[PDB]
Amino acid sequence: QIQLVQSGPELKKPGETVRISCKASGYSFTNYGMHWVKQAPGKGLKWVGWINTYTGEPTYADDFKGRFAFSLETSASTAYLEINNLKNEDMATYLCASAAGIRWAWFAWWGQGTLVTVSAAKTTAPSVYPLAPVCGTTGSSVTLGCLVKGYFPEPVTLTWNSGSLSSGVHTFPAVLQSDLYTLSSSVTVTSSTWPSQSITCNVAHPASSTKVDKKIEPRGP
Amino acid sequence: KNYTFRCLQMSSFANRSWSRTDSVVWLGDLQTHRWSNDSATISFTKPWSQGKLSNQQWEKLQHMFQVYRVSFTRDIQELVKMMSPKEDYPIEIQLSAGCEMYPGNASESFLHVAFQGKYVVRFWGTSWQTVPGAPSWLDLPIKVLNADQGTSATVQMLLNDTCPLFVRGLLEAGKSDLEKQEKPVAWLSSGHRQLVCHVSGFYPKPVWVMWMRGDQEQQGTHRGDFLPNADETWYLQATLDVEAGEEAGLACRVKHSSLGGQDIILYWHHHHHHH
Amino acid sequence: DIQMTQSSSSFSVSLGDRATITCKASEDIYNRIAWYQQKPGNVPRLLISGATSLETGVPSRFSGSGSGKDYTLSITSLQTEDVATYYCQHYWSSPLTFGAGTKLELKRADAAPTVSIFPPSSEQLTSGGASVVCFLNNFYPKDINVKWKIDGSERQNGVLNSWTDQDSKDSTYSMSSTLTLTKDEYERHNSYTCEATHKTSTSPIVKSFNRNEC
Amino acid sequence: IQKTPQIQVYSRHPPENGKPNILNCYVTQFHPPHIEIQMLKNGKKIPKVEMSDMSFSKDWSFYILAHTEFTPTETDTYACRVKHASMAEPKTVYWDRDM
Ligand SMILES: CCCCC/C=C\C/C=C\CCCCCCCCCC(=O)N[C@@H](CO[C@H]1O[C@H](CO)[C@H](O)[C@H](O)[C@H]1O)[C@H](O)[C@H](O)CCCCCCCCCCCCCC
Ligand SMILES: *[C@@H]1O[C@H](CO)[C@@H](O[C@@H]2O[C@H](CO)[C@@H](O)[C@H](O)[C@H]2NC(C)=O)[C@H](O)[C@H]1NC(C)=O
Ligand SMILES: *[C@@H]1O[C@H](CO)[C@@H](O)[C@H](O)[C@H]1NC(C)=O
Numbered sequence: 001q002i003q004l005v006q007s008g009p010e011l012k013k014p015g016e017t018v019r020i021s022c023k024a025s026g027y028s029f030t031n032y033g034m035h036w037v038k039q040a041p042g043k044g045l046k047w048v049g050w051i052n053t054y055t056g057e058p059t060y061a062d063d064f065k066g067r068f069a070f071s072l073e074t075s076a077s078t079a080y081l082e083i084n085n086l087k088n089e090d091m092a093t094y095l096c097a098s099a100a101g102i103r104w105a106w107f108a109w110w111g112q113g114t115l116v117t118v119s120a121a122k123t124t125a126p127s128v129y130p131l132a133p134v135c136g137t138t139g140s141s142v143t144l145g146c147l148v149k150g151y152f153p154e155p156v157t158l159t160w161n162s163g164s165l166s167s168g169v170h171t172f173p174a175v176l177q178s179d180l181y182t183l184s185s186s187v188t189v190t191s192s193t194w195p196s197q198s199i200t201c202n203v204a205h206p207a208s209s210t211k212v213d214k215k216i217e218p219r220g221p
Numbered sequence: 222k223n224y225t226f227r228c229l230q231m232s233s234f235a236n237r238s239w240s241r242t243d244s245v246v247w248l249g250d251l252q253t254h255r256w257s258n259d260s261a262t263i264s265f266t267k268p269w270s271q272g273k274l275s276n277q278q279w280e281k282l283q284h285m286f287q288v289y290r291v292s293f294t295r296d297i298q299e300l301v302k303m304m305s306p307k308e309d310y311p312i313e314i315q316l317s318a319g320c321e322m323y324p325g326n327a328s329e330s331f332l333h334v335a336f337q338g339k340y341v342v343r344f345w346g347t348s349w350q351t352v353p354g355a356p357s358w359l360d361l362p363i364k365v366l367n368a369d370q371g372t373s374a375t376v377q378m379l380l381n382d383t384c385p386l387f388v389r390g391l392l393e394a395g396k397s398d399l400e401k402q403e404k405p406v407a408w409l410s411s412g413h414r415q416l417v418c419h420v421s422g423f424y425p426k427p428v429w430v431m432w433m434r435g436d437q438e439q440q441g442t443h444r445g446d447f448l449p450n451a452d453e454t455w456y457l458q459a460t461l462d463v464e465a466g467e468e469a470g471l472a473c474r475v476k477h478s479s480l481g482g483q484d485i486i487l488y489w490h491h492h493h494h495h496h
Numbered sequence: 497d498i499q500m501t502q503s504s505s506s507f508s509v510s511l512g513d514r515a516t517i518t519c520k521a522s523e524d525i526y527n528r529i530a531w532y533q534q535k536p537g538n539v540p541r542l543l544i545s546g547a548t549s550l551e552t553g554v555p556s557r558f559s560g561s562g563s564g565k566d567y568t569l570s571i572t573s574l575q576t577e578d579v580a581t582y583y584c585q586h587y588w589s590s591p592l593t594f595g596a597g598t599k600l601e602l603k604r605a606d607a608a609p610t611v612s613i614f615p616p617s618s619e620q621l622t623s624g625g626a627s628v629v630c631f632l633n634n635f636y637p638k639d640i641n642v643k644w645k646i647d648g649s650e651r652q653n654g655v656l657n658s659w660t661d662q663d664s665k666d667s668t669y670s671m672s673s674t675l676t677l678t679k680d681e682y683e684r685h686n687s688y689t690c691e692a693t694h695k696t697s698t699s700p701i702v703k704s705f706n707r708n709e710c
Numbered sequence: 711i712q713k714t715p716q717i718q719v720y721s722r723h724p725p726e727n728g729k730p731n732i733l734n735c736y737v738t739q740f741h742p743p744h745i746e747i748q749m750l751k752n753g754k755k756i757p758k759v760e761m762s763d764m765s766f767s768k769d770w771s772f773y774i775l776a777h778t779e780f781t782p783t784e785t786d787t788y789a790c791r792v793k794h795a796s797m798a799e800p801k802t803v804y805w806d807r808d809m
Contacts, residue, residue: 031361035592037540045532045540045583045594054303061591062497095539100365103299105587106530106545113539131614131629135710143612145629147620147674170633172658172672182656184672186612186631219615221710229765231743231772245765255763288526288563295589313742315770335770338711338741371527371546408724410808421722448736450722451760451777456734458720492808 001026004096004111011117011153012086020081020114022096030054032098034079035105036070039113040092048094050102051079059102083116091118117153121179125208126151130201131184135219143188144216146201150180151208158185159202165189223322224249224399226388230316232297237310240294248391249399250426251453261287267398272390282383285375300365305358313337320384322392330380344376402479403454407487409473409494413462416489418473421456429476432461439471498522500584502595508603508637515571517598519584524564531560531569532583534597536661540583544569574600579662601638604667608696609635613689613703616682626682630690630703632671637695638662642673645689651675683707712796713771715740717803719790721782725807730781733805735790738773746793747776750802752786784809 007021022034036048049060051070058070071080083090093115097107131145148156158171168188174181187199200215225247232242246254246266255264263283265271271279301308315335320328332344341355348367351359367373392399405423409416420430426447432439441461448456459473468489475485488495499522509515519529527547532540544550544560547567559570571578579602584595609632616626632640638659644651654677660670673690689704716739722732735749743764749756762775776790788805 031364037594044581044597045585047592047594049591059590099587100368101299101302102587102590102592103296103528104365104368105592106542106585107532107540108542108545108551110539110541127620127623129617129620129627131617134613134615134705143610143631143633145612145614145631147617147627147629149620149625149627170631170660170670170672172660172670175656175658177656177676182674184629184631184658184674186633186670186672188610188633219710231764231766233743243764245763247765252763252765257763292526311742315766317766338713338770340770369546370549374549406724419720419724421720448718448720448734449762449775450734451732451762451775452722456720456722 002098002109004098004109006094006096006111006114009115009117011119013120014086014088014118016086018083018086018116020083020094020096020116022079022081022111024077024079024098027098029074029077032100034070034072035097035099035107036081037095037097037107038092039095040089043092045095048081050099050105052101053079086116086118088118090116092116119152119179121152123208124150124152124180125210126156126181126203126205126212128201128203128212128214130214130216131186132216132219139191141188141190142194143186144194144199145187146185146203146214146216148181148183148185148203150177150182151205152180153207154181156181156183157202157204158183160185160187161200162202165199223324224388224392225321226319226384226391228254228316228318230314230318232293232314232316234297234301234312234314235310237298237301237308240298242290242294248388248395250449251395251398253391253395256286267395269391269394269398272387272394274387274390296366300362303358303361305356318380320380320388322385322388328385328388330384332376332380344380347373347377404479405455405475405477405485407473407475407485409487409489414464415460415462416468416471418459418461418487419456420458420473420475420485421450422454423457423477423479424454425478426455427478428455428457429474430457430459431474432459433472433474434470497591498525498586498588498593500586500593500595502582502584502598504598505596506599506601508601509574510603511576512573515574515578515600517569517582517584519562519567519569519595521565521567521586521588525586525588527563528586528588529560529562529567530585530587532585532594533578533580534583535580576602601662602667604636606696607634607636607668609633609640609671609692609694609701611690611692611701611703613705615688615705615707621679621682624679626677626679628675628677628682628688628690630673630675632673632690632692634663634666634668634670635694635696636668638669639695640669640671641693642671643691643693643700644673644675645687645691646685647687648689711741713739713741714796715745715792715794715801717790717792717801719788719803719805721805721807722777725782727782727784730779732777733780733788735776735803736773737776737790737792738767739771740794740796741771742795743772744795745772745774747774748791749776749778750789750791751780756780756788 003025005023010018030053033050033052035050038046038048047061048064051058067084069082093113095113096111098109099105126148129147171185174183200213204211227247230244234240241258244256252266253270318332320330322328334342349363403424405420408419432442443460445458471489473487503518530545531543534540543554548560557572561568581597581599583597612631614629654675656674658672687706692701715737718736720734749759756778759778764774766772789802791802793800
């Protein structure tokens with residue numbers, strides 16, 4: 001039952017501070033030291049350092065000295081990671097892991113991780129654009145698109161016909177366009193089904209209370 | 222209840238950046254291996270020290286041990302950070318590991334660890350454990366080390382299988398050394414006034430030395446410690462408290478396996494002692 | 497600092513095949529190496545520590561090996577359950593460093609991308625901007641190059657790309673490429689081209705549309 | 711803690727003058743293992759003194775053997791001097807024999 005539970009996702013602006021927590025249970029807190037690992041969006045694991053849960057003595061990996069500080073409250077078996085003056089390069093998921101010192105630092109137990117998002121942008125609702133095929137078309141099947149542009153923060157949920165159309169869908173990972181997010185999705189059906197049956201793109205952005213439908217229509221003159 | 226194979230390790234830790242480790246290996250009371258801190262490889266002290274193991278098999282062991290030595294140092298240096306009293310340098314770790322060989326297939330292995338000259342930890346069965354009496358603070362280090370299953374698994378294989386298998390090799394390979402018979406030579410000499418009977422050059426250890434007046438064994442014969450000679454033979458002295466005039470009629474008698482039933486009988490005189 | 501460099505960032509294997517991932521340390525780490533499996537969305541899972549010792553949870557098809565600087569993780573026969581990223585890590589001295597990770601993907605017969613191009617919607621145009629979207633769907637292998645052409649000239653500024661992970665069902669990859677312009681810059685030109693070079697064809701797959709045509 | 715060394719000087723063979731012999735200095739019962747041992751002839755130290763590898767017996771205390779090849783004469787005295795962390799002053803033990 002050795003278990004590590006971390007604080008929820010954090011959304012912060014450049015320069016601000018963040019304080020992540022990590023409650024341990026199922027073992028004597030003072031036995032194993034607490035390690036911190038950083039993982040930026042699709043980047044692989046970097047060791048931030050560790051703190052001795054008996055003495056309180058921290059050790060920081062060189063790349064994290066200054067701006068990163070480990071503290072703990074032995075009282076309530078909780079470790080803390082504090083990042084000051086947040087920078088874009090800090091935007092990552094931070095995982096806590098308990099292990100004995102450094103020479104026995106293989107990490108069998110991991111916290112679920114805490115995603116810290118660093119961005120100056122304020123909440124913005126997406127624009128949804130129906131993407132219809134080029135004007136005037138042979139081929140057994142046909143491909144329709146949907147463009148979600150300029151929203152913050154993540155995520156949005158895109159469905160087709162309220163979820164009634166999930167086969168032949170590709171919803172792509174969002175990408176940062178300037179300061180905001182842009183995501184696109186493509187659905188493919190047979191020629192006989194469109195525009196015989198109406199296909200509507202559904203986009204929801206919970207952070208701004210936005211629920212928007214767009215019916216895809218063929219093009220004019 | 223015969224030959225005991227001992228690997229003796231001496232590690233000294235002065236600063237947190239100075240340490241050395243030296244080892245000697247014994248089969249009974251004959252030195253088979255030496256491994257000083259200076260040397261990257263283990264030394265043979267006897268022509269037959271490689272036992273029955275092939276050069277490749279031996280290479281595998283040497284390598285196994287070289288990894289162990291470096292690893293041991295670093296483990297101890299780190300573990301000192303969580304000891305009591307806090308970082309109590311200097312630190313003297315001693316290890317005594319091997320197996321006692323018996324008739325047939327029977328053998329029992331051992332691994333004993335002494336900290337600051339006191340027996341504290343042994344390897345027992347599948348894990349390290351602190352012995353009764355051992356200081357309270359050792360609990361965390363041993364728990365930490367017991368997480369290293371790889372080590373446990375290796376040590377188990379070494380103790381259960383490797384040791385007895387290797388030593389049988391040695392006992393066969395060095396049979397003509399281990400079974401040598403070396404004859405004792407005796408001489409006499411002088412805050413208690415006493416006569417000293419010196420008995421030197423014998424092998425193996427079992428020896429019988431007694432002061433005697435004729436048939437009568439002198440019960441006041443004090444047997445000394447067994448002292449080693451440079452050439453792997455033994456030295457021992459039996460003393461007897463005597464006042465001036467009690468010397469005449471005394472003799473030193475020596476029974477030893479090498480003599481073939483013909484005991485040394487050495488009679489006393491005016492420094493002119495005789496057979 | 498001890499560097500931990502894993503040979504490959506990723507390679508494809510036929511389901512069922514023997515896989516071997518090599519991790520090379522910049523200096524002798526005498527067996528103090530751990531292997532981790534991580535899947536997108538999950539936490540790292542420890543497989544092997546001490547070079548060879550498996551965690552009691554881990555299936556026996558996983559296997560750790562090596563000595564000195566060179567260490568290997570091995571899977572006797574890869575299952576679908578095993579497509580993930582694998583990290584090596586030393587714990588010989590501070591600082592602890594992880595390898596860059598080796599992502600295991602699945603091998604598959606080659607498949608050319610289905611390319612579709614999309615001119616800007618009425619809504620976006622009337623709002624000021626104009627995005628030309630190109631989908632490159634269901635292709636293998638993942639290696640693809642997309643090039644934009646406006647009136648036969650290459651265009652580099654303005655494009656944003658997004659890639660999907662290997663499809664859990666059909667083992668294909670997909671890509672979307674978006675060229676974003678102002679309404680004015682867009683109405684300046686005639687033809688917009690989405691051009692894809694891919695293993696499956698010695699000459700690029702070309703999709704165009706003319707702005708003045710229907 | 712520390713344990714003070716016990717020095718023992720003895721010859722390999724019956725000591726007769728003019729016959730080659732080996733003198734042994736056997737130091738035991740000390741801790742820690744760092745020790746200085748030299749063998750002396752008439753107060754000046756003997757240059758060629760051979761030293762066994764340090765070892766320890768069951769009680770965990772250290773021991774070491776020093777030995778030197780010598781031919782005893784009637785006018786030569788030999789001793790073994792030891793310096794150790796446990797003793798404030800170096801201990802010298804003389805070879806004693808009937809004369
Ligand atoms: C036959 C010829 C004779 C020559 C012998 C010469 C000298 C040695 C003689 C006697 C000493 C007895 C040696 C027995 C110890 C052998 C241990 C072998 C295992 C080893 O190398 N462990 C190494 C390396 O582990 C790695 O490598 C392994 C590969 O074998 C595994 O992959 C493992 O998972 C990985 O972590 C570990 O670092 C291990 O923890 C070293 C420490 C073992 C000794 C324990 C000491 C007792 C505890 C002391 C108390 C703590 C003091 C408080 C500060
Ligand atoms: C005992 O031997 C070890 C290994 O041969 C020595 O450790 C080396 O020490 C120097 C620092 O003086 C380092 O640069 C090397 O990295 C060390 N090598 C290893 C493998 O650890 C040690 O110094 C020797 N100790 C004594 C007292 O001579
Ligand atoms: C080694 O021996 C002990 C008994 O002394 C036993 O309990 C243990 O399981 C053995 N290990 C192996 C690997 O044979």
